[PDB]
């Protein structure tokens, strides 16, 4: 199913 | 103004599994709707509890290997890939200059065998993860990837270290998001000179400016044997410098052609994503080994996955530059269409673009005043960037973009002046 991938390099974002 | 999702109406939490409802287009936590990760795969089109009663149940699909599984890693190790030697450039540290990159617009991966000449400052190969703890902080929280689950988790650096040197590892954990720019470890590391020379933030981000400076140039990678990171395009379409201090890393590189970018976007929004190797869908997937003391440079837009064949400690970072501005913008649009949470996007991407635009303007004018012309890639990039500027400032779109526009920037004048300069160069380029 359409799922958000989280195993990636984060930037802290916002 | 923070968005919320699911039946629980909570802001995004990267530590929880989420699926999208086709009907709603809203996202739902697996645990909130009773869908376990292991069974999510069997669902093609998910219908949330509400949409279900109003428009029928979810659409089921129809053994498959699960990406990140121990079986997946073994099969990957035995897969035949294309030899990266036929495409990657191997300049020496002293040959890797801005001029060298401009020759082909830094369009293919670059692997430097020895740090000599890279102007890189790093601790010795005897640095340990334990030393990272001492310099970063045992109590600092970090994002850790549970490779078997291909999901992000959060724990104390100190806890991760305990797991690392632990005489047992029932779980495959991988740390790839520890940016230490604001810790003391930052004093022991200087990014490659070529990175600092090309970096938009490094050179064009002013002091204060009302926006926090994006810090994504110094990351510490601590990966245990068999860790695996699936195919992706780094945030903001940034380029990547990757130095293996101890151990080894294997990269699977795919060129960002229009076909592969389309294939990538379809794969990133599929219901099968975790059951298929994206590498099998492209014509060329290059396998590149990066060993101790070697430094890999990944260009804008290049799709890649990463396997850690042995425990590994490495340093790396991300940076935006002007050699392929259109590709950076393309990556940016893909992130938007995929509903990418902010923690996986380049922070203040649009703001730095505005500063770059202003800068590129001065360069064009500066070159014209000194009876000289810009390289072709700059013209192409200046143009794609000016197009984005126009798109972000259109009456109907401005509300979603005005906030990132620097106060010291006159959008209309910038856009008009840039269009003038670009057009001039295009006329001169037409003479020949
Ligand atoms: O080290 C890893 O497992 C994954 N790393 C990357 O994708 C990177 O640094 O760009
Ligand atoms: Fe990456
Ligand atoms: Ni940058
Ligand atoms: Zn929920
Ligand atoms: Zn719904």
Short mmCIF file of C-alpha atoms and ligand atoms in Angstrom, two decimals:
data_model
loop_
_atom_site.label_atom_id
_atom_site.label_comp_id
_atom_site.label_asym_id
_atom_site.label_seq_id
_atom_site.Cartn_x
_atom_site.Cartn_y
_atom_site.Cartn_z
CA UNK A 1 0.00 0.00 0.00
CA UNK A 2 0.97 3.65 -0.45
CA UNK A 3 3.19 4.21 2.59
CA UNK A 4 5.51 7.00 3.73
CA UNK A 5 9.16 5.99 3.69
CA UNK A 6 11.09 6.89 6.84
CA UNK A 7 14.37 5.00 6.40
CA UNK A 8 16.08 8.02 4.82
CA UNK A 9 18.54 10.76 5.82
CA UNK A 10 16.76 13.42 7.88
CA UNK A 11 17.58 17.14 7.97
CA UNK A 12 15.46 18.05 10.97
CA UNK A 13 13.47 19.96 8.36
CA UNK A 14 11.01 22.59 9.56
CA UNK B 1 0.45 26.34 11.11
CA UNK B 2 1.18 22.62 11.53
CA UNK B 3 -0.72 19.93 9.57
CA UNK B 4 -2.30 16.92 11.30
CA UNK B 5 -3.37 13.49 10.00
CA UNK B 6 -5.17 10.23 10.74
CA UNK B 7 -8.20 9.60 12.95
CA UNK B 8 -6.12 10.86 15.87
CA UNK B 9 -5.52 14.29 14.30
CA UNK B 10 -1.85 14.41 15.31
CA UNK B 11 1.07 16.17 13.63
CA UNK B 12 3.48 13.95 11.67
CA UNK B 13 5.69 11.56 13.66
CA UNK B 14 8.46 9.96 11.56
CA UNK B 15 8.68 7.06 14.03
CA UNK B 16 5.26 5.69 13.12
CA UNK B 17 4.18 3.66 10.09
CA UNK B 18 1.64 5.50 7.89
CA UNK B 19 -0.49 4.63 4.87
CA UNK B 20 -2.59 6.83 2.59
CA UNK B 21 -6.31 6.47 1.89
CA UNK B 22 -6.98 6.84 -1.83
CA UNK B 23 -10.49 8.17 -1.18
CA UNK B 24 -9.43 10.71 1.46
CA UNK B 25 -5.85 11.34 0.42
CA UNK B 26 -5.23 11.66 4.14
CA UNK B 27 -2.63 9.56 5.96
CA UNK B 28 -3.28 7.05 8.69
CA UNK B 29 -1.10 5.45 11.35
CA UNK B 30 -1.10 1.70 10.88
CA UNK B 31 -1.76 1.13 14.58
CA UNK B 32 -4.69 3.59 14.57
CA UNK B 33 -6.50 1.69 11.80
CA UNK B 34 -5.40 -1.85 12.66
CA UNK B 35 -3.05 -2.38 9.73
CA UNK B 36 0.21 -4.03 10.72
CA UNK B 37 3.30 -3.27 8.61
CA UNK B 38 3.70 -6.91 7.59
CA UNK B 39 0.22 -7.05 6.04
CA UNK B 40 0.19 -3.56 4.51
CA UNK B 41 1.85 -5.00 1.41
CA UNK B 42 -1.26 -7.05 0.55
CA UNK B 43 -3.18 -3.80 0.17
CA UNK B 44 -3.18 -2.04 -3.21
CA UNK B 45 -5.68 0.73 -2.55
CA UNK B 46 -6.32 1.43 1.11
CA UNK B 47 -9.70 2.63 2.36
CA UNK B 48 -9.85 4.19 5.83
CA UNK B 49 -12.64 3.18 8.28
CA UNK B 50 -14.76 6.16 7.29
CA UNK B 51 -14.31 6.05 3.53
CA UNK B 52 -15.01 2.32 3.77
CA UNK B 53 -18.61 2.61 4.96
CA UNK B 54 -19.31 5.42 2.48
CA UNK B 55 -17.54 3.90 -0.53
CA UNK B 56 -16.74 0.23 0.06
CA UNK B 57 -13.73 -1.63 1.62
CA UNK B 58 -10.04 -1.49 0.69
CA UNK B 59 -8.78 -3.05 -2.54
CA UNK B 60 -6.63 -6.13 -1.93
CA UNK B 61 -3.91 -7.20 -4.38
CA UNK B 62 -3.28 -10.39 -6.38
CA UNK B 63 6.64 -15.50 -2.34
CA UNK B 64 7.86 -11.82 -2.34
CA UNK B 65 11.10 -10.73 -0.64
CA UNK B 66 10.88 -7.75 1.73
CA UNK B 67 13.38 -4.92 1.17
CA UNK B 68 15.85 -4.77 4.03
CA UNK B 69 15.18 -8.34 5.13
CA UNK B 70 18.18 -10.60 5.77
CA UNK B 71 17.06 -12.53 2.69
CA UNK B 72 16.98 -9.33 0.65
CA UNK B 73 20.55 -8.48 1.64
CA UNK B 74 21.86 -11.95 0.75
CA UNK B 75 20.18 -11.80 -2.66
CA UNK B 76 21.53 -8.28 -3.23
CA UNK B 77 25.08 -9.41 -2.48
CA UNK B 78 24.75 -11.99 -5.27
CA UNK B 79 23.11 -9.70 -7.85
CA UNK B 80 25.00 -8.75 -10.98
CA UNK B 81 25.20 -5.00 -11.60
CA UNK B 82 26.78 -2.79 -14.21
CA UNK B 83 30.43 -1.89 -13.55
CA UNK B 84 30.60 1.70 -12.27
CA UNK B 85 34.13 1.86 -13.69
CA UNK B 86 32.68 2.55 -17.12
CA UNK B 87 31.13 5.86 -15.96
CA UNK B 88 32.58 7.21 -12.69
CA UNK B 89 35.47 9.66 -12.88
CA UNK B 90 38.53 9.12 -10.66
CA UNK B 91 40.34 12.42 -10.34
CA UNK B 92 43.06 12.80 -7.78
CA UNK B 93 42.40 15.19 -4.89
CA UNK B 94 44.36 17.94 -6.63
CA UNK B 95 42.64 17.40 -9.98
CA UNK B 96 39.16 17.72 -8.46
CA UNK B 97 38.71 21.43 -9.10
CA UNK B 98 35.72 23.61 -9.90
CA UNK B 99 36.98 23.82 -13.48
CA UNK B 100 37.07 20.02 -13.70
CA UNK B 101 33.47 19.79 -12.52
CA UNK B 102 32.31 22.43 -15.01
CA UNK B 103 33.61 20.43 -18.00
CA UNK B 104 30.61 18.08 -17.79
CA UNK B 105 28.42 19.93 -15.28
CA UNK B 106 29.37 17.43 -12.54
CA UNK B 107 27.05 14.93 -14.23
CA UNK B 108 28.53 11.62 -13.04
CA UNK B 109 29.73 10.20 -9.72
CA UNK B 110 33.31 10.94 -8.76
CA UNK B 111 35.44 8.64 -6.61
CA UNK B 112 38.70 9.88 -5.10
CA UNK B 113 40.98 7.06 -3.89
CA UNK B 114 43.10 9.06 -1.44
CA UNK B 115 42.12 12.17 0.53
CA UNK B 116 45.36 13.91 -0.49
CA UNK B 117 44.45 17.20 -2.12
CA UNK B 118 40.79 17.12 -1.08
CA UNK B 119 41.38 19.79 1.59
CA UNK B 120 39.49 17.59 4.00
CA UNK B 121 40.06 17.71 7.76
CA UNK B 122 39.13 14.55 9.64
CA UNK B 123 40.28 12.59 12.69
CA UNK B 124 42.54 9.57 12.15
CA UNK B 125 41.30 6.10 11.04
CA UNK B 126 41.60 5.14 14.70
CA UNK B 127 38.57 7.25 15.61
CA UNK B 128 35.83 5.01 17.03
CA UNK B 129 32.08 5.35 17.45
CA UNK B 130 32.90 5.58 21.15
CA UNK B 131 34.88 8.72 20.39
CA UNK B 132 31.84 10.08 18.57
CA UNK B 133 29.81 9.56 21.73
CA UNK B 134 32.36 11.50 23.80
CA UNK B 135 32.27 14.36 21.31
CA UNK B 136 28.57 14.36 20.47
CA UNK B 137 26.88 13.37 23.72
CA UNK B 138 25.60 10.10 25.17
CA UNK B 139 22.26 11.68 26.02
CA UNK B 140 21.62 13.17 22.58
CA UNK B 141 18.63 11.75 20.74
CA UNK B 142 19.28 10.58 17.19
CA UNK B 143 17.32 9.01 14.37
CA UNK B 144 18.24 5.35 13.93
CA UNK B 145 17.07 3.13 11.10
CA UNK B 146 15.82 -0.35 11.87
CA UNK B 147 16.96 -1.88 8.58
CA UNK B 148 14.87 -5.05 8.86
CA UNK B 149 11.76 -2.90 9.20
CA UNK B 150 12.99 -0.09 6.91
CA UNK B 151 11.63 2.31 9.50
CA UNK B 152 13.09 5.14 11.51
CA UNK B 153 13.46 4.95 15.30
CA UNK B 154 14.73 7.39 17.91
CA UNK B 155 17.12 6.63 20.75
CA UNK B 156 19.98 8.11 22.76
CA UNK B 157 23.36 8.08 21.03
CA UNK B 158 24.61 6.39 24.19
CA UNK B 159 22.02 3.63 23.77
CA UNK B 160 23.04 3.09 20.14
CA UNK B 161 26.70 2.83 21.13
CA UNK B 162 25.83 0.17 23.72
CA UNK B 163 24.07 -1.75 20.95
CA UNK B 164 27.03 -1.26 18.62
CA UNK B 165 29.87 -2.61 20.76
CA UNK B 166 27.34 -5.08 22.16
CA UNK B 167 28.39 -8.72 21.96
CA UNK B 168 25.03 -9.39 20.32
CA UNK B 169 22.88 -7.71 17.67
CA UNK B 170 19.39 -9.14 17.28
CA UNK B 171 18.58 -6.04 15.26
CA UNK B 172 20.22 -4.39 12.26
CA UNK B 173 20.44 -0.70 13.14
CA UNK B 174 21.90 2.10 11.04
CA UNK B 175 22.65 5.71 11.92
CA UNK B 176 22.83 7.99 8.87
CA UNK B 177 21.12 11.16 10.10
CA UNK B 178 23.46 12.42 12.83
CA UNK B 179 24.37 15.96 11.76
CA UNK B 180 27.00 17.14 14.29
CA UNK B 181 27.56 20.67 13.01
CA UNK B 182 26.59 22.12 16.42
CA UNK B 183 28.62 19.70 18.53
CA UNK B 184 32.32 19.62 19.37
CA UNK B 185 32.87 16.86 16.82
CA UNK B 186 32.39 19.69 14.34
CA UNK B 187 35.76 21.15 15.36
CA UNK B 188 37.50 17.94 14.21
CA UNK B 189 36.00 17.97 10.73
CA UNK B 190 36.22 20.19 7.68
CA UNK B 191 34.32 19.21 4.54
CA UNK B 192 36.18 18.75 1.21
CA UNK B 193 37.33 22.04 -0.29
CA UNK B 194 35.37 21.41 -3.50
CA UNK B 195 32.19 21.15 -1.41
CA UNK B 196 32.77 24.45 0.40
CA UNK B 197 33.56 26.16 -2.91
CA UNK B 198 30.35 24.98 -4.61
CA UNK B 199 27.98 25.03 -1.62
CA UNK B 200 25.15 27.56 -1.90
CA UNK B 201 24.65 27.84 1.86
CA UNK B 202 28.38 28.03 2.56
CA UNK B 203 28.82 30.98 0.21
CA UNK B 204 25.46 32.73 -0.14
CA UNK B 205 23.66 32.38 3.18
CA UNK B 206 23.95 35.72 5.07
CA UNK B 207 24.29 36.24 8.82
CA UNK B 208 20.91 36.18 10.60
CA UNK B 209 18.64 37.10 7.66
CA UNK B 210 15.69 36.07 9.89
CA UNK B 211 16.01 32.43 8.80
CA UNK B 212 17.97 29.68 10.55
CA UNK B 213 21.02 28.59 8.55
CA UNK B 214 20.52 25.14 7.00
CA UNK B 215 23.09 22.74 8.49
CA UNK B 216 23.36 19.60 6.38
CA UNK B 217 27.05 19.46 5.49
CA UNK B 218 28.40 17.37 8.39
CA UNK B 219 26.87 13.96 9.07
CA UNK B 220 28.35 11.02 10.91
CA UNK B 221 27.44 7.59 9.54
CA UNK B 222 27.64 4.57 11.84
CA UNK B 223 26.41 1.43 10.15
CA UNK B 224 26.64 -2.18 11.23
CA UNK B 225 27.26 -5.03 8.79
CA UNK B 226 24.36 -5.67 6.38
CA UNK B 227 22.69 -2.28 6.92
CA UNK B 228 20.76 -1.24 3.84
CA UNK B 229 19.33 2.07 2.66
CA UNK B 230 16.86 1.83 -0.22
CA UNK B 231 16.92 3.86 -3.45
CA UNK B 232 16.38 7.60 -3.04
CA UNK B 233 17.35 11.07 -4.21
CA UNK B 234 18.91 13.12 -1.41
CA UNK B 235 16.75 15.99 -0.12
CA UNK B 236 16.53 19.12 -2.24
CA UNK B 237 18.35 17.18 -4.93
CA UNK B 238 21.59 17.91 -3.07
CA UNK B 239 24.91 16.44 -4.14
CA UNK B 240 26.73 14.20 -1.66
CA UNK B 241 30.28 13.89 -0.40
CA UNK B 242 30.87 10.55 1.31
CA UNK B 243 34.09 9.58 3.14
CA UNK B 244 34.54 6.06 4.53
CA UNK B 245 36.81 6.40 7.57
CA UNK B 246 36.68 2.73 8.58
CA UNK B 247 35.12 -0.22 6.80
CA UNK B 248 33.32 -0.17 3.45
CA UNK B 249 30.14 1.06 1.72
CA UNK B 250 28.52 -0.10 -1.52
CA UNK B 251 26.46 2.29 -3.63
CA UNK B 252 24.00 1.39 -6.41
CA UNK B 253 23.83 4.41 -8.71
CA UNK B 254 21.17 5.18 -11.30
CA UNK B 255 21.43 8.12 -13.68
CA UNK B 256 18.63 10.70 -13.37
CA UNK B 257 17.37 10.48 -16.98
CA UNK B 258 13.79 11.57 -17.56
CA UNK B 259 12.79 7.90 -17.86
CA UNK B 260 14.45 6.86 -14.60
CA UNK B 261 13.05 9.89 -12.78
CA UNK B 262 9.56 8.95 -13.94
CA UNK B 263 10.20 5.32 -13.00
CA UNK B 264 11.49 6.45 -9.63
CA UNK B 265 8.44 8.60 -8.87
CA UNK B 266 6.09 5.76 -9.84
CA UNK B 267 8.06 3.37 -7.64
CA UNK B 268 8.02 5.81 -4.72
CA UNK B 269 4.22 6.02 -4.87
CA UNK B 270 3.52 2.33 -5.50
CA UNK B 271 1.84 -0.09 -3.09
CA UNK B 272 4.59 -2.60 -3.87
CA UNK B 273 7.58 -0.33 -3.17
CA UNK B 274 8.93 -2.51 -0.36
CA UNK B 275 8.62 -5.71 -2.40
CA UNK B 276 10.58 -4.68 -5.47
CA UNK B 277 14.19 -3.79 -6.17
CA UNK B 278 14.14 -0.50 -8.06
CA UNK B 279 17.46 -1.42 -9.63
CA UNK B 280 15.72 -4.03 -11.80
CA UNK B 281 13.61 -1.39 -13.51
CA UNK B 282 16.33 0.72 -15.08
CA UNK B 283 18.66 0.01 -17.97
CA UNK B 284 21.81 0.77 -15.98
CA UNK B 285 22.32 0.40 -12.23
CA UNK B 286 26.00 0.91 -11.36
CA UNK B 287 27.62 -0.82 -8.38
CA UNK B 288 30.26 1.28 -6.70
CA UNK B 289 32.43 0.17 -3.80
CA UNK B 290 33.84 2.84 -1.53
CA UNK B 291 36.57 1.59 0.78
CA UNK B 292 38.48 3.04 3.73
CA UNK B 293 40.12 6.39 2.99
CA UNK B 294 38.18 6.84 -0.25
CA UNK B 295 35.72 9.64 -0.93
CA UNK B 296 32.68 9.39 -3.19
CA UNK B 297 30.91 12.42 -4.65
CA UNK B 298 27.33 11.87 -5.82
CA UNK B 299 25.87 14.37 -8.36
CA UNK B 300 22.50 16.11 -8.34
CA UNK B 301 19.48 13.86 -8.82
CA UNK B 302 21.36 10.55 -8.89
CA UNK B 303 19.15 7.78 -7.54
CA UNK B 304 21.01 5.46 -5.20
CA UNK B 305 20.74 2.71 -2.60
CA UNK B 306 23.46 1.77 -0.09
CA UNK B 307 24.66 -1.54 1.35
CA UNK B 308 27.08 -1.72 4.27
CA UNK B 309 29.02 -5.01 3.81
CA UNK B 310 30.93 -4.58 7.10
CA UNK B 311 30.70 -2.41 10.22
CA UNK B 312 31.43 1.09 8.98
CA UNK B 313 32.09 4.57 10.30
CA UNK B 314 31.90 7.37 7.76
CA UNK B 315 31.44 11.09 7.35
CA UNK B 316 29.47 12.90 4.69
CA UNK B 317 27.18 15.77 3.89
CA UNK B 318 24.86 17.36 1.38
CA UNK B 319 25.20 20.52 -0.65
CA UNK B 320 23.37 22.46 -3.34
CA UNK B 321 25.29 24.11 -6.18
CA UNK B 322 24.89 25.80 -9.54
CA UNK B 323 26.09 23.09 -11.93
CA UNK B 324 22.66 21.48 -12.41
CA UNK B 325 20.07 23.81 -10.93
CA UNK B 326 17.28 22.37 -13.05
CA UNK B 327 17.83 18.89 -11.60
CA UNK B 328 17.75 20.26 -8.04
CA UNK B 329 14.39 21.91 -8.86
CA UNK B 330 13.15 18.65 -10.39
CA UNK B 331 14.01 16.75 -7.20
CA UNK B 332 12.16 19.45 -5.26
CA UNK B 333 8.98 18.97 -7.32
CA UNK B 334 9.14 15.21 -6.90
CA UNK B 335 9.29 15.63 -3.11
CA UNK B 336 6.19 17.84 -3.20
CA UNK B 337 4.23 15.42 -5.36
CA UNK B 338 5.18 12.62 -2.96
CA UNK B 339 3.94 14.57 0.09
CA UNK B 340 7.40 14.46 1.67
CA UNK B 341 7.51 15.56 5.33
CA UNK B 342 9.77 18.54 5.98
CA UNK B 343 12.42 16.54 7.85
CA UNK B 344 13.20 14.86 4.52
CA UNK B 345 13.42 18.08 2.51
CA UNK B 346 16.22 20.63 2.27
CA UNK B 347 15.42 23.28 4.92
CA UNK B 348 14.55 26.67 3.45
CA UNK B 349 15.23 25.39 -0.08
CA UNK B 350 13.34 28.27 -1.70
CA UNK B 351 15.05 30.93 0.46
CA UNK B 352 18.54 29.84 -0.56
CA UNK B 353 17.34 29.73 -4.18
CA UNK B 354 16.37 33.42 -3.98
CA UNK B 355 19.82 34.35 -2.65
CA UNK B 356 21.41 32.29 -5.42
CA UNK B 357 19.28 34.06 -7.99
CA UNK B 358 20.49 37.44 -6.77
CA UNK B 359 24.06 36.17 -6.81
CA UNK B 360 23.77 34.68 -10.30
CA UNK B 361 22.45 38.07 -11.42
CA UNK B 362 25.56 39.83 -10.16
CA UNK B 363 27.75 37.20 -11.82
CA UNK B 364 26.05 37.67 -15.20
CA UNK B 365 26.33 41.46 -14.90
CA UNK B 366 29.88 41.13 -13.60
CA UNK B 367 30.88 38.92 -16.52
CA UNK B 368 29.22 41.22 -19.04
CA UNK B 369 30.95 44.28 -17.56
CA UNK B 370 34.31 42.51 -17.86
CA UNK B 371 33.71 41.59 -21.51
CA UNK B 372 33.15 37.91 -20.67
CA UNK B 373 30.34 35.36 -20.81
CA UNK B 374 29.07 32.66 -18.37
CA UNK B 375 29.44 28.94 -18.94
CA UNK B 376 26.47 27.32 -20.66
CA UNK B 377 25.36 25.33 -17.60
CA UNK B 378 24.94 28.59 -15.67
CA UNK B 379 22.66 29.98 -18.36
CA UNK B 380 20.52 26.82 -18.35
CA UNK B 381 20.41 26.88 -14.56
CA UNK B 382 19.77 30.60 -14.35
CA UNK B 383 16.86 30.11 -16.73
CA UNK B 384 15.28 27.14 -14.91
CA UNK B 385 15.68 29.05 -11.67
CA UNK B 386 14.07 32.21 -13.05
CA UNK B 387 11.17 30.04 -14.21
CA UNK B 388 10.74 28.78 -10.63
CA UNK B 389 10.93 32.35 -9.32
CA UNK B 390 8.04 33.28 -11.63
CA UNK B 391 6.04 30.22 -10.59
CA UNK B 392 6.46 30.97 -6.89
CA UNK B 393 5.42 34.61 -7.29
CA UNK B 394 2.31 34.18 -9.42
CA UNK B 395 -0.74 35.87 -7.87
CA UNK B 396 -2.53 32.57 -7.22
CA UNK B 397 0.56 30.76 -5.90
CA UNK B 398 2.27 33.51 -3.89
CA UNK B 399 0.52 32.69 -0.58
CA UNK B 400 2.28 29.31 -0.32
CA UNK B 401 5.68 30.84 -1.13
CA UNK B 402 5.93 34.44 0.11
CA UNK B 403 7.09 33.31 3.54
CA UNK B 404 10.41 31.97 2.20
CA UNK B 405 11.22 35.08 0.16
CA UNK B 406 14.08 37.06 1.75
CA UNK B 407 13.16 40.62 2.73
CA UNK B 408 16.21 41.97 0.92
CA UNK B 409 14.98 40.62 -2.40
CA UNK B 410 12.87 42.45 -4.99
CA UNK B 411 11.31 39.50 -6.81
CA UNK B 412 10.02 41.47 -9.80
CA UNK B 413 13.28 43.30 -10.42
CA UNK B 414 15.32 40.13 -9.84
CA UNK B 415 13.19 38.14 -12.27
CA UNK B 416 13.19 40.87 -14.93
CA UNK B 417 16.93 41.57 -14.66
CA UNK B 418 17.77 37.87 -14.76
CA UNK B 419 15.56 37.33 -17.81
CA UNK B 420 17.37 40.21 -19.51
CA UNK B 421 20.86 38.89 -18.74
CA UNK B 422 20.01 35.31 -19.75
CA UNK B 423 18.46 36.47 -23.02
CA UNK B 424 21.56 38.51 -23.84
CA UNK B 425 23.83 35.51 -23.42
CA UNK B 426 21.43 33.47 -25.56
CA UNK B 427 21.82 35.98 -28.39
CA UNK B 428 25.61 35.89 -28.20
CA UNK B 429 25.56 32.10 -28.04
CA UNK B 430 23.50 32.25 -31.23
CA UNK B 431 26.28 34.07 -33.12
CA UNK B 432 28.27 30.84 -33.07
O1 LIG C 1 25.05 5.01 4.56
C1 LIG C 1 23.94 4.67 4.21
O2 LIG C 1 23.39 3.50 4.57
C2 LIG C 1 23.10 5.50 3.27
N1 LIG C 1 23.74 6.78 2.93
C3 LIG C 1 23.34 7.62 1.95
O3 LIG C 1 22.43 7.37 1.18
C4 LIG C 1 24.05 8.92 1.77
O4 LIG C 1 24.92 9.28 2.54
O5 LIG C 1 23.67 9.75 0.78
FE1 LIG C 2 21.79 9.27 -0.11
NI1 LIG C 3 24.47 24.02 0.22
ZN1 LIG C 4 -3.30 8.00 14.24
ZN1 LIG C 5 -10.20 8.08 3.63
#
